[PDB]
Each structure stands twice: as C-alpha cells, then as structure tokens.
Design a protein around this ligand. Structure first.
Ligand SMILES: *C(=O)[C@H]([C@@H](C)O)[C@H]1CC(SCCNC=N)=C(C(=O)O)N1
Ligand SMILES: *C(=O)[C@H]([C@@H](C)O)[C@H]1CC(SCCNC=N)=C(C(=O)O)N1
Lengths: 595, 598
C-alpha cells in the first residue's frame, strides 16, 4: 500500500513506503520472540497472562521507524521475516515498545544494546535460552540491514519532487495514504533533460580541467557509482596508460585517448598545459572515476563536475511541469535547484521590465537612452563600460544595457515593476524596493523564471506551474483531477478556468519577437525565442527560452558562489543544455509560435 | 473512542484518550482556515488554487501534534474548540504545524510557534485573504492555549493509573489508542475505603511528629494542586491568634486559633517542640499552606501534607484478584505506586514463611526453641531489644520476633528450601541473598509479593498470581480477553488448578498462629490472622493480614530510608490503616477462615 508516482505516460517511477504493518497469526510467532517480550519486563499483574494480552498488540505495537507490529519491525530493521530473526534480534525488538525513540537501534545504538543484553540476561535466568545461546546473542553486533523503502531509481528528481512537496505541505501522513499520483512529467522529455544537464555540466567541467583523483589510499568499498561513472583504484601507471581495479575485482586499462583531455585545472580562468604522460594525471592508489563505452571494450578517465546545474520545462498554456532536473545527479543529495535553488537572474529579468516599457506605449523600434547615469551615489555601468546613446529598445535588450534598464525603471516606476515581478511569479520579500531590481539582483527560483517566460509564449497570461495531473486512491477511485488556469482555452482542442492576463497581448508578442530575434542573431527551428543571463563575476549562467508549446529555463553555477570564469556567460554555459534539450524535445513537432 | 477502565461492578472510573480524529465535511470548513493552509508555504506546484483542491484530501488526516490528526482534533486538543469557534490567529497557529509538529508545537516551543504563526498571518495579509484590521488584531493576540485533559482519572486515581501505566509499560502508547474496554478486578467500595484509610493513617503519623513548616515560601500559588481534601493557600496576614490566607479561587479565608493550635514544631523523628501560643510561631506572610474546610464550609483549619508515605494492597487469596490498591498518600501528590514498584525490606513479616517451613519439617507451634546468642561464622545476629528468652515455644518466638530463633530455624530448614519458597511468590533469585540474613527480613520485596505470600496461609498452601484484569472488551463490545487465573480451590467459586507450595497442615497451623497473634497479642471478627513488621531503626512499619476471602498488606515509611522514630512500630503505624480498611471492607460478610486437608 505505498505512495506510487507515475509519469504522464503511465510509467511507475517511484514508490514511497509510509507506516508499515504486516499482521501475522499468533501461532506463526517463533517461541523465543514471545519469550523475549515475556522477559522484557520485570513483572506483570494482568507469565502466561502477558502471553494472552501480547496476542492483542503484537501486530499493532509501535516499534519505531514507521514499524507497527513485530513483522514490520523485522522487515524495516533487518529485511527479515519473523522466522529469520536471531535471539539477539528478537530481544532488540522486544525492548523497543517501552520507548521506541530512546531505545531505537538507529538513533541510540549504545542505549539499545544495554536494553537488548539485559533482556537476554533475563531470558537466560528464566530458562528461555541456554548459556551457549546467551553467549553468542550478547556478543552479536547491531546487524541492522535496513531496506530502502523509497524506491526512486528511474527519474529521481521527478519522484522526489512529489514526495518532498507532499511532506512539506501535508506532513509525513501524506505518504501513509497509499495514493497513486499521476504527474504531468513527460518521461521522454525527462530522460532528455537528465542527459542534457549531465552532458552540459561535464562539457563545462572538462574545459576547466582535471582536478585530480577524489581520494588517495582510501578503500574503494567506501565509494559509489553514479551518472555512469564508476569508482576505481589505480594499480599500475605506464607512460601512455594506467591500470585500475574496479568495484567487482576486475582490472581495466585506460589508454592515452581515454585520459589525454586532462589538462590540470589551475582556477576558473586557467588550465595548465596538455599532459605529456599518464604519471602527471594519476598516482598508484588514487581513487578515480571511469566510464566504459556501450560495448564495455574501452574505458575513459572521467570526472564528476564540481559545478552544478538544473533544467525546468513547463507548458506555457497551463504551467504543467514536463521535465525537471535539480542537479548534476540525484545521488549527490536530494537538493532540487529548480524548486529550492535561489539565485540572482541577472539579464534574464530584463525582458520582464522591457515588457512593462512596451505596456506604456513604447515599441521594439522606440529610441532609448544608453548614456551615463547616476542615482543618489550609485552609477549603474554597462558590463562592457561603453555607452551607445540613442538606440532601439530591442537593441538595448539584446545588448543588456544597464543604464537603459535603470532609465526604463524610472519611466515605469518601481512598485509597478515589483507588482509585475510578483505577477510574473516572484516572491514579495525577495523583490527589493530599490533600483538594483532592473539588474536582476533579487533572488529568484528557476521555476519562477519559467513561469514568467510563459507570459511571452502564451500571449500575456499568468500560469501556475503544476506537477499533478490526477490522484487515485488504492481502490482506483479518482479523488483529484487538476483544474489548471489556461492561457488559451480553445488551444486544448487543437477547459473551465481562464488564467488572468498580466500583460497586453501586443506587449507579450512584441517581447516574444524580440527574444526570437535575439536567438536568431546568435538548431533548425524558426519558432524559438530566448534570453541569456550572466550574474556579476560570472557566478550564474542562465538561458530562458521557449516555443509556444514549451518553456525551458537552464542554469549553471557553483552551490557556493565562486566565478564560473570570465568567458563563461549564459550563451556559453547554460544555452547548450537548453539547445540539446529543446532540439530533442521539439523534434518532429510543427512550428508553434504565439497565437 | 478512548481506553475505558471499569471496576468489578461495571462502573466507569477512567478514560484515557489516545490519537484523535474528528472528520469534517469540507463545506463545514471556515474559508479563513483553508486560507491559513494556503499561506503556510511560499510555493505550491501541485495563486494557491490547486493546493486548496488537494487540501480536502488531507484536512482530516494531517498530524498536528499532541495526538491530533486533522483540523478538528487540533482545535479540540489545543483550544477545546470546534473549528468554527477558532480565531484567525488560532487558525494560523494550526496551519503552521503540518511541516514540523514538534519544531513548531505551541506546548514544546512557544517562541518558534509564535514566530511561525505571525509569518502565516503576514502572508494571509499580503495574499489578500485577511484585511489589515483582521491582521493587526490577529498578530497582537496571544497563544491562548486551552488544552482539555483527555486522561480522565479523578475517581480512583491509583486504580485507573495501574491499567494505563501497566498497558504502556508492556505495549507502549498503541495500548491507549486501541479503544479497548478494560474490566478490572477492583472493588469500588473497597478502593474507596482503602484511599481514606491510607490518608487517615498517614495524617495520624504526620500529626504525632509535628508541624514541619509551610511546604513553600514566596513561590507562585498557581504551581500547587489541591488533593486529599487539602487546599493550597498563600498566607497574606499573620495576626496574634489567627491568619489570613489567599485561596486559588481568588477568595481570602481566616483560620482561627482552633485550626492551628495543634502546630507543635517538629524537632526530629523523636522530638516535638513546645505547643505554640501565637500565629507568628507557626506561619510567615508569603508562606504556601494547606487548609481543610468542613462538611459544608464555615471554618478552615491548617492541615499538613505528610512527608511520610504509605501503601495498601488487597487481594483475593483464591485467585490473586487485585481488589483495592493505594500506591501512596495521594496520586496527585505522587504518581508513583509503592504497592507495585516500592522495593523495601519486609523485616518480621517474612518470618511466618520460614516458621511455616519448620512446621513442614515436623515441628508444632509448641516445639521448644532456643532464643539465645548465636554466631554464624563472622556474623552474630542480635535481638532488637537486646534480650534473650531461652527455651520458648515456636509460636512465642514468632509473636515476639526472635531473630536468634529465626536464624536457628533457617539452619534446620536450610537456606535453599527457604529461598525456593520466597521465589514461589514473585521474588527474584537476584533479590534474595544465599545467606542467613534472609531470616531477619533483609531481601528487598514489593508489597504485592508479600500479599501473594500471605494468600498461601489464607488459601491452604497454594501459589496464586496477582491479576488486575478480569476481561477486555474491544470498542465494539466483543470480549477479546477473559482472565484464566490459577485457583487455589475450584469448587470454592472455573478451570486452572493452582500449584501447592506448602503442606496443607503447615499453611493451616501458620494461619492459626497468625490468628492467635491478632486475637490475643493486640474489629468484631474472629476469622483474622496477621503479622506486624518493623525494620531496623524503624525504617519501615508493616502489617500483613488476612481472612479466607481477603489478604491486605499495609506499609508506612519515608521514600528516602529514614527512621519513623524510636516509638514507631508496625503495630502503631501500619496496623491502624489495616484495621480501618479490614473492618469496613469485611462489614456484613460471614466469617471466612482457612480449610484443612490431609
Ligand atoms: C545580464 O546578464 C548582464 C547585465 C546584468 O550586466 C549583461 C552582461 C552579459 S555578458 C557581456 C559581458 N561584458 C563584456 N564586456 C550579459 C549576458 O546576456 O550574458 N548581459
Ligand atoms: C521485625 O520486624 C523485627 C525483627 C526482624 O527484628 C522485630 C522488632 C520489632 S519491634 C520490638 C522493639 N525492639 C526494640 N527494642 C518487631 C515488630 O514487628 O514490631 N519485630
């Protein structure tokens, strides 16, 4: 009866176990277990009387860690049936009822063993166990063999998105429901996004160079495989090749072509010279990451990036989350950068403020002033330190001119913009009450940016991102069906709630065409528009783009902001991920621009 | 549907409420409450449209802390309200709980609870769910907890608590949530008698030992509880012959000289000071005192909550049914149950067991025994009075509690046979040493075990098990447990035969020795047997006694082993409680004595 997660293509991707109860008939209980409970307590005034009353609770008793009853405890703690438990394990379970958190083997192992051994000592005294049984049982370690009750190995960020969001809003009882959650996640598009982010971050990583082995003279057993990287121990180093021991005991050779890319990393802005020998890259006893080819006939030295990234893709008509990638790989941590990654948008915020200039009567052709500006003490300068004078609004956006954005902010007013940013999705207490908000200094989430860019793809409507299509109970009854706010109700036909208009149709179409011009003046599609973003000191690289059927926002940055390096702008780091995802997601679909 | 506790006459004495859920129709929900849940988190991705639709699925299930599952259970548990009676602030408070019911709990962390609630109220304002007028009112509003008590145990507190604590001790908190109906062996008439006998008995000792001063001085009056017909008061004015005191209801009373003239100061366990002549000698302003009213009211008197403790345990000798149980002076003073958990030395109350084993080996109440000095290795046991009686009958040695005779009998019987019998009534091997001191009543015992022991004399040599549950009924009235005890005599009541641990003649001869000790060595009844006990330096006062239908054990002493005083003995401290109880418990019952069989 777990919480089951499906993709929009009816594939089960995840299963989340809640409170567990596995009832057993009383005659199925090994004698030593009942004895371990009979000996858990000093005295009973209900010794054969406790036996009759134990029979009424043996299946309901809270045994910590979502375990209700003896069988669920055997399963949760040891992955064993009640038959498989040892004297020591039976006494460990028998000691938990009194205080399952104070006596828990997971949180208090010391306190737990004190309790277990005493019960064993009291089992010995009662004649329940032999002296030999007691001697082994007391000497036995914790032996916890806790199975994973969170099956999430297909599209990890999609599965976790469901679990984590349910738990945040409805608490842990949300899992205990046994519901089937049918998401808006497209499994093909999700598989594409996962591969694209992985490739994008590795491309960035390799050009920034080899940072050395992740560990030296440490046990290989202590490392784990992920993102098609396999831990290995270097055993032999040759002039052009090295030998490594895999986690299965097999010895592999990595030839020159497999490691030659390994120029040493110096900093974000510097790599050393191409390596002239294998000895400059690896040491014997080093823990490296290898990747095989499809045939497994050749191996290469690979590297997990230190840089991070994310992708979020939504339908601009209804806000359906089609694909979501929260980091390089889910094994690293459960942290989802699309939903929780607060970062500065920089220039990706500019189309929002320029669309507000269009609301006021300006056209993409209207002349704007790119001349020096000073407000109070602050002198907003341009990233190139140049001033272009009278230029068209569209050129000013394309070139991301800070003085123009600052001047546009005064002409349109701060509150009017803050309100629009709030309309676009953005958080009220995250949007400052100053002029820096024309530069993309407020913190945003990639999902908010996707939501805001949808206003351009949909004709000026505010959509709300959503991941649930429908929910069923365990019996098959549909208990929830998504009723999103639609930008275009007749577009579903190719139904009920109409989304609110946040921009004039003409402002949205004008902005969409500027972004299309911005994309075409750098794949084989004429229905895409997009905007790059780079924060100060290249701490962030963004790409926010779309067609009329899909909005995609990509981001690249370090979790602890450090520069990505000069040369690492939006169009260089984030855009290739977007291009790779968009090109494959929109492959063999007609042109879909704005209505 | 709570855990229900019943007396043997099918009357409800306790209700223990566990996990609570009061489901509601979604239309019955105030919109402001739904809005509070919408303002609880910054971002919803299921402007909070879809969360409102999904909320309905979880609204009656969400764990809200303190056994509350769903909104209505939370409104009841925290505020003793229905959802439609909650203020905007209280709605914001509950909506703050789902994320971390223990990190935001108003009981556990009131500052984190307040911070979270105000954030939610702030968001309700920003989102336009509440007007600034509503917001300003709501943030200034305090926590205002009004938590009802869901553990109802105000009739026979030690009886109700026995069930709750014992079910939790063996089965954990799931035992309370079961909703089972526990039909106990407790006799309500007798339980009521037991409570008063212990209270009267302890107040009698306490008084003889003098006024030890107010329980507190310059401490908040709201931190004290009324119990055992004693009400905490704050002394506000001290006159020459009287004193004024502030009661918890907010009223002020006057206690005249009559109600405080008794207050002789406690000097030590053996000394009481000079009778007071003025109020200042007894009380000071800001003192926290205990007062007692009357049958109606009119007059209040200065009373004293005893430092000394006691207990009473009454069991049926045929099947071990627990009829009456008092764990201390008052359960509201101490939750601790001394009958079940109070390990103490029995002293002379263990002697009848040893003397019964000597009768088992062929001696009679008349066999001559030597009360004379003895040395067992490096140990010389002495008689408490430092007197030696020479050659005397066994029964005189038992009545007078001759340690030297006890030691000689232990040599005749053997330590092992003695230890085996001690164990036959719940005594742990670990709790009984393999030495000659066991004859002097040195092992630590529980009153419940001594009661079980004395039932061997009352029943004719059989081993019975103390039991407090007759049957268990599920929430839907089905009998899910029926007690199957071991009966000493089956025709006497209907299946299990109890194991004989003592020869019929030994049990019967001991019973008559105990009857003699009670009729000539100290109630209008002749079917009674019993033995007093007084440990060294009077650290314990005991009285174990019976008739053929009821075995009662009473104990008096300080929880921290301290002398009851030179002059205090079992016969003076524990025996009067036993008397008061037995006389009243056995009223209108025909004579009931022990049966002999060859
Ligand atoms: C927007 O992202 C910023 C803006 C906040 O200053 C500018 C900077 C760049 S990159 C050009 C760097 N200057 C070279 N001398 C962009 C961009 O779109 O990435 N816009
Ligand atoms: C039993 O409790 C003890 C025995 C084990 O020593 C004796 C002592 C007394 S009191 C007699 C006065 N002694 C001091 N001079 C009793 C008793 O039961 O009261 N039995």
């Amino acid at each position: 009866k777990p919480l089951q997660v499906y993709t929009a293509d009816n594939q089960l991707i995840a299963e989340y176990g809640g409170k567990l109860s596995i009832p057993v008939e009383y005659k199925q209980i090994p004698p030593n277990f009942i004895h371990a409970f009979l000996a858990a307590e000093d005295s009973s005034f209900f010794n054969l009387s406790k036996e009759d009353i134990l029979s009424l609770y043996v299946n309901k008793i809270f045994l910590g860690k979502n375990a209700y009853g003896i069988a669920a405890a055997a399963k949760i703690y040891y992955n064993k049936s009640i038959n498989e438990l040892s004297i020591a394990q039976m006494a460990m379970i028998a000691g938990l009822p009194k205080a399952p958190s104070k006596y828990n083997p997971v949180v208090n192992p010391e306190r737990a063993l004190e309790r277990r051994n005493w019960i064993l000592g009291r089992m010995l005294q009662l004649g329940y166990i032999s002296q030999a049984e007691y001697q082994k049982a007391v000497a036995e370690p914790i032996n916890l063999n806790m199975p994973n009750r969170d099956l999430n190995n297909i599209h990890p960020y999609a599965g976790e998105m469901v679990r984590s969001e349910l738990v945040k809003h409805f608490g842990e009882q949300a899992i205990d429901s046994g519901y089937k959650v049918y998401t808006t996640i497209n499994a093909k598009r999700q598989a594409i996004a996962e591969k694209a982010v992985q490739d994008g971050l590795e491309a960035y990583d390799r050009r920034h160079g080899w940072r050395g082995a992740e560990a030296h003279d440490k046990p290989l057993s202590e490392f784990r495989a992920y993102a098609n990287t396999y831990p290995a121990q270097v055993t032999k180093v040759n002039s052009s090749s090295f030998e490594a021991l895999m986690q299965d005991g097999s010895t592999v050779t990595v030839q020159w072509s497999g490691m030659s890319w390994a120029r040493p990393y110096r900093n974000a802005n510097s790599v050393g010279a191409a390596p002239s020998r294998a000895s400059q890259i690896v040491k014997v006893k080093d823990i490296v990451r290898l990747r095989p080819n499809e045939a497994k006939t050749a191996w290469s030295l690979v590297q997990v990036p230190k840089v991070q990234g994310q992708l979020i893709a939504i339908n601009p008509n209804d806000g359906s989350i089609e694909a979501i990638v929260g980091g390089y790989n889910f094994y690293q941590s459960k942290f989802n950068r699309a939903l929780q990654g607060w970062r500065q948008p920089g220039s990706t915020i500019k189309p929002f403020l320029y669309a507000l200039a269009l609301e006021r009567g300006m056209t993409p052709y209207s002349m704007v002033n790119d001349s020096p500006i000073t407000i109070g003490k602050w002198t907003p300068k341009n990233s190139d330190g140049r001033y272009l004078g009278m230029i068209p609004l569209r050129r000013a956006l394309y070139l991301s001119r800070n003085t123009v954005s600052v001047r546009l902010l005064q002409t349109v007013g701060i509150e009017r913009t803050r309100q629009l940013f709030m309309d676009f999705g953005l958080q009220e207490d995250q949007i400052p009450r100053n002029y820096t908000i024309a530069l993309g200094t407020p913190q945003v989430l990639p999902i908010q940016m996707a939501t805001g860019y949808a206003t351009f793809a949909n004709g000026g409507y505010r959509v709300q991102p959503h991941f649930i299509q429908r929910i069923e109970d365990a019996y098959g009854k549909v208990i929830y069906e998504a009723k999103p706010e639609y930008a275009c109700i007749p577009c579903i036909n190719a139904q009920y709630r109409q989304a609110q208009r946040i921009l004039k149709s003409s402002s949205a179409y004008d902005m969409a065409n500027i972004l299309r011009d911005v994309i075409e003046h750098g794949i084989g599609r004429s229905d895409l528009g997009g905007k790059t973003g780079t924060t100060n000191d290249a701490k962030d690289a963004w790409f926010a783009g779309f067609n009329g059927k899909l909005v995609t926002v990509t981001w690249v940055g370090f979790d602890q902001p450090t520069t990505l390096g000069r040369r690492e702008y939006g169009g260089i780091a984030a855009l290739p991920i977007w291009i790779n995802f968009m090109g494959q997601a929109l492959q063999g679909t007609p042109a879909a621009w704005v209505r």
